Amino acid sequence: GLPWYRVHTVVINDPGRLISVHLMHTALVSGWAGSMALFEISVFDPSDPVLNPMWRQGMFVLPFMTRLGITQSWGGWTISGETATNPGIWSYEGVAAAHIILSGALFLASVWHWTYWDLELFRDPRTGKTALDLPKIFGIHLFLSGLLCFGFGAFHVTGVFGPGIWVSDPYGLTGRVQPVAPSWGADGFDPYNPGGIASHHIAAGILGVLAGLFHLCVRPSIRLYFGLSMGSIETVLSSSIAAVFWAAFVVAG
Amino acid sequence: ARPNPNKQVVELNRTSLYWGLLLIFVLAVLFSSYIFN
Amino acid sequence: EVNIYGLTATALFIIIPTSFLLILYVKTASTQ
């Protein structure tokens, strides 16, 4: 008879159902994203950006779309005040509806794994138990994260193939969305230099790809293996919560 | 007899679960416009 | 003007018989 506060411990040793609840959590987060975007569009007033900005209205997830360059809606109005002709696929409502479609797709993906959890990936081919190879999984995920980081820094930030980010007048009058020249000197660590944010991910994704391939190739020592209990799974959770709340103070500061 | 000789068990299957939930939401969908007026 | 009481009545008429049916279903499917 389990207590109420440990009911998710039935999927310590069931990785398909673990993927199923990862998918369901991701679907719920995307559903919040789409619903908050649509609610904030329906409340939002574009009437005068001179005296009634976004932040007076309590608008929350729209100054992130505007931060990364989504500056147009299907109504024809824009942020700075004028109207733009072509809204394209990617307007505010389109981003919101795309997240709703992601929510439904990840829902239907989440149903399938817990319906069919007993496949042959999650099985030791050597001896016949249900394990998972955590340093190689970490190498795969670090390699993927490095690829997406490098692509985001190279293309979408600097305006190679994406449209750029919001880079503004420091006196707060004439800000707009711009492709950013990545600076590589000592001014790249001044956090008031968007060239630093541009040149960040270029180095970060490359180093992440290198480390990810390193962990795909080599295997750890027995000393660190017993010292960190890498055969267990919950050490990854204890390390990940640590990394997440280290990130949280940075994004709050 | 001090313990009750008529302690009996309620039983509600999944078909009746779906019928009851569908009844409650259909009643809500119908009457909600007239309640909000 | 929308009702002060209407959304409360809607939410109550949703949640109360829903929970009433969920209690009975979980009690039923616990045994079998």
Binding site: - | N13, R14, T15, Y18, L22, F25, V29, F36 | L7
Partner: peptide, 30 residues
């Protein structure tokens, strides 16, 4: 305000339709 209540009720009805179709008890034999 009330449009969200309307949409929530319609989507909840469709969700109960979905779970009723796919997550029923299996009608089993003898």
């Amino acid at each position: 305000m009330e449009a969200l209540v309307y949409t929530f009720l319609l989507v909840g009805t469709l969700g109960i339709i979905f779970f009723s179709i796919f997550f029923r008890d299996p009608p089993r034999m003898i």
